[model samples]
Target: GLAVELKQSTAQAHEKAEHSTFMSDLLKGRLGVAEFTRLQEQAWLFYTALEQAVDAVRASGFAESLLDPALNRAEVLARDLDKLNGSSEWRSRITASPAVIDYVNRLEEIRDNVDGPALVAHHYVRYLGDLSGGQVIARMMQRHYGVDPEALGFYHFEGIAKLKVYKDEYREKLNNLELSDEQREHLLKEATDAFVFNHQVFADLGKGL
Candidate 1:
């Protein structure tokens, strides 16, 4: 019974991210119309793989409770950016730079991998949120590492601060959930897999920079 619930919850959560404002902004920042399409295709594929796996478990709810708020937040982000132009000009600025393309390709690989609540299910709190390491990285990117806004937008964030609030809510929810040690361990394993993926992907991206 509980197993079915877990599956349902995860499916919905990932789908929410797939349909988020962040995803739209991400697509908006592509180097070209073609590149944007290509990137979105790749991203959709990544999430679809996870979504399919969630569905395949044939669990009744499949983590829908987990998915709903996330999807809603994504929708709100999309709306937040509705009137604002996406990254059309931003891409044109960097089109000639391989460093930009390299960063984009590398980051798009795992950009959406940082889906909020979905990540929480894995039992790892976000460390790169608004107040997280991202701020430090941004300051370092510009001050010490010599990165421009154009080059760093793919990984740079100004809204990561909102993450702390969301994270607090997330933590409270975690404290309320009735997870077993085995289940908690499994969730932690999922987070470790995410880190391994980013480490390799970012390593490849850094080479281009």
Candidate 2:
């Protein structure tokens, strides 16, 4: 019989992981709420602005074919901004709170610019996932929060169900490239930078709350 190593509970792991992530990023440096919100707004701006080029790369075949479908899937999120059908009470509650207003603005930005983020996600998973022993935080995030269709739409519609399949495909696409290891490493490094860029936005926005 094979023996298995039992692990600790997810709650414990989750807290530890969160701490580790912040430490890894040296997140000790803090800022004021308003400044943080402004930083968040700036991060959102960068994430959106990058799209003007991501789309160009995809359309021009500068990006891989596997990336093409991912771009298509991203469009659903772009259009979902219009789906935020809320009642008057909802608006009232949200507006009354400074936190909610800031959150809503960030959420709308997320809704509007999701397509590009989806494109960036591939590279993110490729490099950062590999670096962090395989996207430990994100997989957990999805499982914990993706219970509702509306909440899960971003991931579900992005075609992450077959995560392994996509990872294999991504590897295959890069397997035979003539680029040197250093070049490949640099590209992957850029993915990590992109991930940080994305997170800096969220971190800034989270401070608003």
Candidate 3:
């Protein structure tokens, strides 16, 4: 199955992303609210591009089975950023890091060409991580960084009731997608690149901290 292949192929990159210095520190409570907010800002940029790409290819039948509006995170991230920043002007106060800009550019590139398989690779990396490890990160932020639950809406998937079942179904959809071996390999490579992009985001954010 493509889902199992993706998981197995990217396991090392996945581990590296999980243990990135910034993520490790943030999870351990060594980082503060400002750092957490910064992370959310980058997430907003990334998801905005990803969702836009989804919108661009909505009619192409490429992402039909995997398309779920409930999984979109940009709006939630925006609201959470407003609460965390204590004002609606949070957008003006933050700038995308170099890594973030590169990430967005890649997504936009995928969008411009309507690259469905590549987009799926990017989508799988993020939304799956959000459904799985992101839950733990959200709880740790609340417990250690003292963030209010309301300000952590990015991890709240009200539309998803049974996480495990939903995830399994999502994987099934991935497996069901018809693709050539070349396309499948492209997706696997993009999935690995997705993790590297995330690691770069962490590295850029970890600077001077």
Candidate 4:
């Protein structure tokens, strides 16, 4: 019920962002490989900060049940970037977008404040999308960008029986978390803001209408 309520509350923002020009062009395979690389490049910032923050939170009182190793993307994105950019030193090529900088900063703030609920909210926005539409993006990249299907390491998972089952169990773990009503509301707001910040990244990347 809490998961359903969270989804319902965020539906409009989520739906509108689904049609974002950046993501729309991506799915349609209209963007160049370099452009696609740019997306991954920017994502490196968020994922790096997220990985660190999630680890730090887990070190604190964060629940072990809610942590999913498959959700991590920093290393995967690094590998993807290295291949696409034609260099192992992929970090040298990236220029962090203003939106990305802000996103990582917010994530760092939550981490420093030891906000576990907010971290979980980010986990919901990013990792769930990866298991969902990110699959489509992986397929499209291989088709349009001449990328080896093997190179789509970001979308590939190991030891997870099925993504659908994993995701269902993920939501159950989240639902079972012993959060107070105010804490639950905090997560709800953080989740909503995560989407807005993501949409801002799209808009700031010069992909908005």
TM-score of each: 0.39, 0.45, 0.97, 0.93
Residues 89-197 of candidate 3 have per-residue lDDT tens digits of 9788777899999999999999999998899999999998788877788889989988999988888898998999999999999989999999899999999999999
How do the residues 149-201 of candidate 4 rate in per-residue lDDT, one tens digit apiece? Answer: 66678887764778888889878887788888888889899888888889878
**Clash totals, every prediction:** 14, 0, 0, 0
CA lDDT, every prediction? Answer: 0.37, 0.38, 0.90, 0.80
Top model number, lDDT: 3
Model 1 has a clash total of: 14
lDDT tens digits, residue span 39-144, model 2: 3234233334344445554565544564544434234433322233222232233121343344334434433544333343333432324433424432543344
Instruction: Please list the residue runs of candidate 3 whose C-alpha ends up more than 4 Å from where it truly belongs after superposition.
Output: none
What does the lDDT come to for candidate 3? 0.90
Which model, 2 or 3, shows the larger lDDT? 3
Best by TM-score: 3
- Please list the Cα RMSD from the true structure of every candidate, rounded to 1 decimal place: 12.1, 11.6, 1.0, 1.8
Model 1 spans with C-alpha error above 4 angstroms: 1-131, 142-165
Candidate 3 scores a C-alpha RMSD against the true structure in Å of 1.0
TM-score of 3: 0.97
Candidate 2 runs further than 4 Å off: 1-51, 71-74, 85-122, 125-148, 158-163, 180-182
